[model samples]
Target: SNAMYKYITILGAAGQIAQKLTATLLTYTDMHITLYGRQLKTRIPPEIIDHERVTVIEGSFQNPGKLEQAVTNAEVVFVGAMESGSDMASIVKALSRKNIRRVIGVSMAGLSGEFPVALEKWTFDNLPISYVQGERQARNVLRESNLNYTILRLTWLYNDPEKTDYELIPEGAQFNDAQVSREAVVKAIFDILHAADETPFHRTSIGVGEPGTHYDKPSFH
Candidate 1:
């Protein structure tokens, strides 16, 4: 009678943020994690891939059969890589067939046209407009789906092990703060996964950023 849905499947697991989140979850919780991505064995650290609690599955989002296998019996799924709405569509179909309802996916900011004028201009200048359009379509896939989902619109990311503070800029609000640490983004997802049935970020697409880091361009630029 102690059955709980503690299994998590991470699609695009080889990505930096996904890998970091996997390590943190392993260190802090007893949930079983399935890492799914192409070339996972080579892309992931041995210490993580070799962990007794971790399972690695090699595959891409384009293959529905492999994706379906990856999400089997998983209670929560995190999507770290998505090129277009087609990618999200594949994942949604897979999760639906598996009956996995909880899903969280990474997305970029400005989907709501909430960024300040300068930042908005900078965003388009640096990132392809087609890519942004693809992201918008991807989010629509989730928004239109029945799954319990959270779309994290993360702003410019940087690696800073020392920082974990972030602000949740809700949908429809003006989004400032140009940069956020990857660790902070991971922590936000962590908080969501650990929450009870009434998950904090359930069915929401919120912007995440490091407070007070707003600038026309990221510090690196």
Candidate 2:
């Protein structure tokens, strides 16, 4: 079927989105997944971890040697890892050492100029500057790396009762946007994974969300 079941490793396998994303990937019979997180004493949910095709490697992203080993033969690496700056660099450097090609890094919508001024201003005032800086640093590293990459600058990820029909815009397509559901984010990741080779924006960024949602249009203050 699907290219002989390639190995896919997720760096931050214990996070909220990673849990759902890993579950979705596991459903595909052609994927062999490895979950890399910090702790191994506990267990991953039975649904995502019990399968024969999934494996767990409990290690820190700071340890390049351990990360390099985990990525050895992985075809795709989903970097769901959380950290500020240098920590993100460490993970990227480790992945660069392996044969890995495709990387899907989860990032925020406004980090790449896709959000409204109000939201962006709020995030800048409230969220740590390092969070945004780390995303940029990670993107820079991936761009410089020879691997193919897709940086998903996601809208505010929400788990709510709202409708699910959404739109995905290329970088700079939209100004201010609210949020997207965790499910939509995971679907976008899969879409990038299955897209054709001629896709022009190989090392590009994009934003994902439901259509016609209320968001502030940017204006000069």
Candidate 3:
């Protein structure tokens, strides 16, 4: 997995899960990472910023030039932010210019209207209208993109340091549960990064959740 890609650019690097992924990659893989986000100087710790393999860049999705700069030497791009669609047009535009081909984007479940009735209702009712709309647009952009992209449609996210267990629900299939730990989602991203080829993971958006936590509403609620 490490040999396949030598450099990765992580969008939304200030987020908890993205930071965890950054630490895990630094600890486990030999790949270099570029962390891009807003106000990263204060948001990221000095230890990480001082790491030899890490490069921190302060930027936002609204700026295509900065995004292009961030992805310049990256072999893979990871979109790890909520409201990812907020500026996916610029994201896709930036990606199109680069030689980078692999991308992994995080999105919430129920965007495709595949969840069970009650869960779907609860998801829509609770999520902000702007966020829902943003994800929908983001998904559409990625789906139409030529890059080898994987969108992880995550359900309600929680933090649990001890567990990384999860189940994958294929695109168009019914989403099974309400919540998955951020660690499990990180595990999924690691697995995808190590994959030899797209075989089962490429150019697809799949649902991710912890098994056996099914309910009519989000687990946190």
The lDDT for every candidate, in the order shown, is 0.87, 0.70, 0.84
Whole-model lDDT, candidate 2?
A: 0.70
Instruction: lDDT winner between 1 and 3, please give it.
Output: 1
Error of 1 at 54 (Å): 0.8
Give the alpha carbon lDDT tens digit for every residue of 59-128 in model 2: 7876778888888888888887434457667766777777566777777777666566777776677668
**Model 1 lDDT tens row, 6-68:** 899998898899999999888878889999888898889998989999998877888888889
- TM-score (C-alpha) between model 2 and the true structure: 0.85
C-alpha positional error of residue 55 in candidate 3 after TM-score superposition, expressed in Å: 0.3
Angstrom error of the Cα, residue 174, model 1: value is 1.4
Q: Arrange candidates by TM-score, highest first: which order?
A: 1, 3, 2
> Model 1, poorest ten-residue lDDT window?
1-10
Model 3, C-alpha of 43: deviation from truth (Å): 0.5
Q: What TM-score does each of the candidates earn?
A: 0.94, 0.85, 0.93
Q: Quote the lDDT for 121 in model 3.
A: 89
lDDT string, candidate 3, 91-164, tens digits: 77788898778888888898787788888888888878987887888888788888888889999888988869
Clashes of each: 0, 5, 0
Candidate achieving higher lDDT, 2 or 3: 3
